[PDB]
Amino acid sequence: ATFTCDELKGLEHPYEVLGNGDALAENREELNKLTNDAALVLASRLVLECPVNELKDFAHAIEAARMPQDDSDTFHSFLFQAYQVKKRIISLLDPRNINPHSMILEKEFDGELFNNFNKLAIDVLTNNEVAIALRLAETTPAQDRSRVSQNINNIFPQSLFAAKVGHAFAVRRDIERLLLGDRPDQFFSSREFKIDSCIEFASLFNVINDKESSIAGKLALRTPAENRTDVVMKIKGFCAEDSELAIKVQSAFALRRDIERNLLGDNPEQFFSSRDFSVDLCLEFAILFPELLKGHEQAIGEKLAKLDAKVRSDISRKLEMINGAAHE
């Protein structure tokens, strides 16, 4: 129950042994007989082994063993500072927390608290860097994006966590300025394109949901021909093969090929009478038509002159509707 100094120094499961008020009070004297390095190490391990769900409980435990004679020099000081480090880091992943970037910007991350307990900070961050970076990329506004990052680089310099936060911020920035923009092919043709950053933070692409039709249309319109296979391979790289984005992008490329081969060829009627023709598909990607048919309506109309009146009228009706679906 009451161990010697070295025995407390050598506990292999410190949270199971000292993780309540009773055990903390029983061992107060021998815990206070510890050197400051040994006390730091023991408090760090004690706080590491404490599961997240018990943290709050553990908090009250630390408060139960608090004494008036507990100044910033006893073991209670080390244990409370360690709990503070772990609580403030883990609250970044708290679902009830709406703005973790606020906590990071409000300088709630003390320099010396995370400087003395930097090993503990890195150990708490271990195996949680991707999750926290994803959360920060999801909730941080763009204006503060580079400030948040800077803080992380000052407190955790040359760490895996800061690198992951940079990566997630880059992926978010490029999904907003490039993928959802007028030139979504530049998202893929950028020199900074990193497939592993896209895969590690794939949840960030959830923002394009129910927008894959527009993105696919703009891709089919603006992507250079030599980049099409590359775009498709990258999408299949960080998206599911049955995801909306892949299906729609490949079908939009196919529709552009159909327009260029059959509609702008010698027998445009084959474009409309083929089993591959779909008014729904032409409408879904209507943005393709004004550009690719610019200054070609008369040649096609001449190549359709010998058709029946019903067929010619139907084709012209469909083209005017498709053009009306464009400019929208």
Side-chain angles (χ1 to χ4, degrees), residues 1-15 17-55 57-65 67-71 73-95 97-118 120-176 178-190 192-309 311-328:
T2 164
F3 308 91
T4 65
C5 224
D6 307 86
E7 284 175 346
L8 296 166
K9 182 185 170 197
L11 300 175
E12 57 190 36
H13 298 299
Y15 178 73
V17 181
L18 303 173
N20 44 33
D22 285 355
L24 282 177
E26 293 171 357
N27 307 269
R28 174 183 292 98
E29 184 181 355
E30 290 297 319
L31 279 166
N32 292 343
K33 294 169 61 175
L34 288 171
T35 85
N36 283 7
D37 291 312
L40 175 101
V41 169
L42 181 56
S44 289
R45 299 173 52 208
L46 182 44
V47 146
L48 272 162
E49 293 189 353
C50 173
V52 172
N53 9 331
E54 307 186 29
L55 266 179
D57 285 323
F58 193 31
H60 294 332
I62 300 176
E63 182 55 50
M67 288 292 163
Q69 42 145 17
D70 263 319
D71 82 316
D73 238 0
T74 51
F75 181 82
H76 177 274
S77 179
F78 289 87
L79 194 58
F80 191 74
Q81 288 176 100
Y83 166 81
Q84 285 287 279
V85 172
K86 176 144 175 180
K87 179 63 231 163
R88 293 180 186 180
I89 288 175
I90 273 307
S91 61
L92 297 173
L93 293 180
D94 184 21
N97 187 14
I98 306 96
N99 299 327
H101 64 277
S102 289
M103 156 173 34
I104 297 206
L105 292 177
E106 289 163 356
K107 319 229 83 179
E108 238 143 275
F109 282 68
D110 170 21
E112 71 172 0
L113 176 59
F114 289 84
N115 185 34
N116 295 318
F117 296 86
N118 195 267
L120 172 68
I122 301 301
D123 291 331
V124 174
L125 288 171
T126 283
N127 291 337
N128 294 322
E129 310 89 335
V130 174
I132 298 177
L134 178 83
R135 190 84 194 284
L136 293 183
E138 287 178 340
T139 71
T140 306
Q143 310 88 246
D144 309 321
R145 194 167 295 165
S146 59
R147 179 135 267 278
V148 171
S149 194
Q150 183 193 120
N151 280 16
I152 305 293
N153 290 305
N154 293 335
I155 293 179
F156 306 115
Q158 304 296 337
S159 56
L160 188 63
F161 175 52
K164 295 297 176 190
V165 164
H167 292 164
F169 276 158
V171 167
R172 178 85 195 277
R173 174 194 58 173
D174 281 3
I175 288 189
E176 270 183 345
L178 299 192
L179 189 54
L180 290 171
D182 289 328
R183 292 297 307 264
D185 55 299
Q186 294 172 343
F187 180 87
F188 302 84
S189 60
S190 175
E192 346 290 330
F193 181 87
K194 295 162 186 167
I195 179 65
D196 59 315
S197 284
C198 293
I199 293 175
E200 263 181 354
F201 300 103
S203 309
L204 290 185
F205 292 89
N206 290 356
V207 64
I208 72 180
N209 275 112
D210 302 332
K211 291 192 178 185
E212 301 92 327
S213 296
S214 165
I215 303 166
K218 298 201 189 71
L219 279 176
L221 181 58
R222 323 284 182 93
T223 308
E226 65 248 51
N227 302 345
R228 299 203 256 248
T229 305
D230 176 72
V231 171
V232 176
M233 295 304 270
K234 283 166 181 175
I235 296 168
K236 269 121 98 70
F238 68 85
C239 287
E241 188 171 28
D242 58 74
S243 67
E244 287 291 76
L245 182 66
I247 302 176
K248 305 246 181 185
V249 165
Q250 296 192 85
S251 95
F253 285 146
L255 172 62
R256 159 142 173 176
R257 211 206 110 167
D258 198 5
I259 294 178
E260 288 175 340
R261 191 182 198 268
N262 297 314
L263 187 54
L264 300 187
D266 293 322
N267 260 281
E269 168 266 338
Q270 301 178 350
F271 176 80
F272 297 94
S273 66
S274 170
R275 62 233 172 261
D276 301 357
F277 182 81
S278 174
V279 181
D280 301 320
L281 180 57
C282 293
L283 293 177
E284 191 179 19
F285 301 132
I287 193 180
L288 280 172
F289 284 82
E291 247 96 356
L292 307 184
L293 301 191
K294 195 230 160 297
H296 282 108
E297 277 103 349
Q298 204 207 51
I300 302 170
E302 293 187 330
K303 297 183 190 69
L304 301 169
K306 289 188 166 297
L307 295 173
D308 288 332
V311 183
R312 282 155 53 242
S313 176
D314 177 67
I315 290 180
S316 43
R317 226 149 49 209
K318 288 174 185 179
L319 283 189
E320 172 214 61
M321 150 149 304
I322 292 161
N323 227 86
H327 322 107
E328 253 188 352

